């Protein structure tokens, strides 16, 4: 009924196998192994007065939405009327108190030496410092890092279909908007399954996998509701979020604000359409595939994704796209 030491969710063998896999202003992400199974560990400092990576730490009340949303989206894998495995599984959440473990600093240093880091080395925390530690299913590697690694546009089709179906199921169940679905937040992992299964308002269907399973991650800007209680991040007074340039990504923030009149509590599932447009645009303009569309059935797939790009902004939600767009028939 209070915070635990780091050793409670990272016992020695688990800590000794941690390798850093990513980062952001929020904190750090590590991969480790327990019971022969990889997991991802997201660690966020809270409640303290130090700047961390140049920003103030969130309070407990500010981090709660991400926790709540992570649980609700994970639970969709085990539901019936609205079921999807397209989010990321959540194994546990803990509030931990202590300085940063030396073994994690070792992992942090290895990443800095090999990939380079934009973050402060997290060695300045005292023994009273609080963190949230979220343990997730390991979802693979992000779409951005797989820019030059995918087989063909047929794989792109499967990825867009999986993302649209996931978002639709979450719309139907939870009035969900992701609100930050840039290509760093789309994970890809190998699957031996030929087709993946979802259920939308009691109607089940399948999606050819092309050998990959997609997981949507990072709920820090997300919104949902149950029984009229809305859980979200109020960015109405954020300046910086809306003044980016150099990528279509930064236009999506501005376009969301236009759609919702700067009222972030409301439900505007058109934001999911905007993100899927951004992702479709990446598929066609920045992704590069090992095999180009050199045949007829493939040249048809290409034309259909091009048609999706130029028509999808005329749909009202991911649900509308899934149920009505020709790409998915
Ligand atoms: C820096 N990261 C962006 C912010 N992370 C999250 O919000 C987050 C949330 C839940 C799970 C994961 C990540 C997660 C699960 N498997 N995995 C594989 C690669 C990976 N992250 C993850 N790379 C780091 C990307
Ligand atoms: Na999942």
Strands 90-97 and 130-137: antiparallel
Ligand 1: nearest atom to the Cα of 185: 3
Strands 212-216 and 224-226: unpaired
Ligand 2 centroid – CA 86 distance (Å): 5
Of 86, 117, 93, which is closest to residue 40 (Cα–Cα)? Answer: 93
Using an 8 Å Cβ cutoff, are 223 and 267 in contact? Answer: yes
Q: Domain 139-329 class?
A: mainly alpha
Using an 8 Å Cβ cutoff, are 182 and 221 in contact? Answer: no
Of 78, 72, 47, 79, which is closest to residue 223 (Cα–Cα)? Answer: 72
| Bridge partners, residue 137, by sequence | 39
Determine if ligand 1 sits within 6 Å of the CB of residue 43: no
Determine if ligand 1 sits within 6 Å of the CB of residue 29: yes
Of 200, 192, 208, which is closest to residue 301 (Cα–Cα)? Answer: 208
**Integer angstrom CA distances of residue 309 from 195, 250, 266, 306:** 24, 18, 26, 5
DSSP 258-321: HHHTT-TTS--THHHHHHHHHHHHHHHHT---SS---SHHHHHHHHHHHHHHHHGGGSSSHHHH
Q: Which long-range contacts (CB under 8 A, 24 or more apart) does 310-315 make?
A: 312/273, 312/276, 312/277, 312/280, 313/273, 313/274, 313/277, 315/273
Q: How far apart are CA 30 and CA 110, in angstroms?
A: 12
Residue located via tokens 């003044």 = 243
Q: Which ligand is nearest to the CA of 214?
A: 2
Provide the CATH topology of domain 1-138. Answer: Phosphorylase Kinase; domain 1 (3.30.200)
How many CB atoms are located within 10 Å of the residue 42 CB? 21
Using an 8 Å Cβ cutoff, are 125 and 45 in contact? Answer: yes
Q: Which ligand is nearest to the CA of 83?
A: 2
The DSSP output letter for 101 is P
Q: How far apart are CA 221 and CA 35, in angstroms?
A: 32
Q: How far apart are CA 187 and CA 183, in angstroms?
A: 8
Strands (E), the chain: 19-24, 27-34, 37-46, 90-97, 130-137, 141-142, 186-190, 195-200, 203-208, 212-216, 224-226, 229-231
Of 174, 156, 158, which is closest to residue 319 (Cα–Cα)? Answer: 174
Q: Give the determination technique.
A: X-ray
Residues of the chain with CATH 1.10.510.10: 139-329
Residue located via tokens 């546990």 = 92
Using an 8 Å Cβ cutoff, are 74 and 90 in contact? Answer: yes
Ligand 1 centroid – CA 293 distance (Å): 31
Determine if ligand 1 sits within 6 Å of the CB of residue 138: yes
Residues of the chain with CATH 3.30.200.20: 1-138
**Integer angstrom CA distances of residue 65 from 80, 218, 221, 268:** 24, 11, 9, 18
Query: For 130, what's the count of Cα atoms within 13 Å in the CB-facing half-sphere?
Result: 14
Ligand 1: nearest atom to the Cα of 24: 1
Determine if ligand 1 sits within 6 Å of the CB of residue 139: yes
Residue located via tokens 């939870």 = 174
Using an 8 Å Cβ cutoff, are 45 and 52 in contact? Answer: yes
Q: Is 22 helix (H, G, I), strand (E, B) or coil?
A: strand
Provide the token pair at 289: 């595939």
Q: SS3 breakdown of the chain: % helix, strand, coil, rounded to 5?
A: 40, 25, 40
Angle at 28 between CA 27 and CA 29, to 5 degrees: 140
């Amino acid at each position: 009924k209070g915070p635990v030491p780091f050793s409670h969710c990272l016992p020695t063998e688990k800590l000794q196998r941690c390798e850093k896999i990513g980062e952001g202003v929020f904190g750090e992400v590590f991969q480790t192994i327990a019971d022969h199974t990889p997991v991802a560990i997201k660690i966020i400092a809270i409640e303290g007065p130090d700047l961390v990576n140049g920003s103030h730490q969130k309070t407990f009340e500010e981090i709660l939405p991400e926790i709540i949303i992570s649980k609700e989206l994970s639970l969709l894998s085990g539901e019936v009327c609205n079921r999807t495995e397209g989010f990321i599984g959540l194994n546990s959440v803990h509030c931990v108190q202590g300085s940063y473990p030396p073994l994690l600093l070792k992992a942090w240093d290895h990443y800095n030496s090999t990939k380079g880091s934009a973050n402060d080395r997290p060695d300045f925390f005292k023994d009273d410092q609080l963190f949230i530690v979220l343990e997730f299913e390991f979802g693979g590697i992000d779409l951005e890092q797989m820019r030059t690694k995918l087989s063909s546009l047929a794989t792109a089709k499967s990825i867009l279909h999986q993302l649209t179906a996931s978002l639709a199921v979450a719309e139907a169940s939870l009035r969900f908007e992701h609100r930050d679905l840039h290509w760093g937040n789309v994970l890809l992992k190998k699957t031996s399954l030929k087709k993946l299964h979802y259920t939308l308002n009691g109607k089940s269907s399948t999606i050819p996998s092309c050998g990959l399973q997609v997981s949507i991650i990072d709920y820090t800007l997300s919104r949902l509701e149950r029984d009229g209680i809305v859980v979200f991040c109020d960015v109405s007074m954020d300046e910086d979020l809306f003044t980016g340039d150099g990528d279509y990504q930064f236009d999506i923030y501005r376009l969301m604000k236009k759609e919702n009149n700067n009222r972030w509590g409301e439900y505007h599932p058109y934001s999911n359409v905007l993100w899927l447009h951004y992702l479709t645009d990446k598929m066609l303009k920045q992704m590069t595939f090992k095999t180009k569309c050199n045949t007829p059935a493939m040249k048809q797939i290409k034309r259909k994704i091009q048609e999706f790009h130029r028509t999808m902004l005329n749909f009202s939600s991911a649900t509308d796209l899934l149920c009505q767009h020709s790409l998915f028939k």
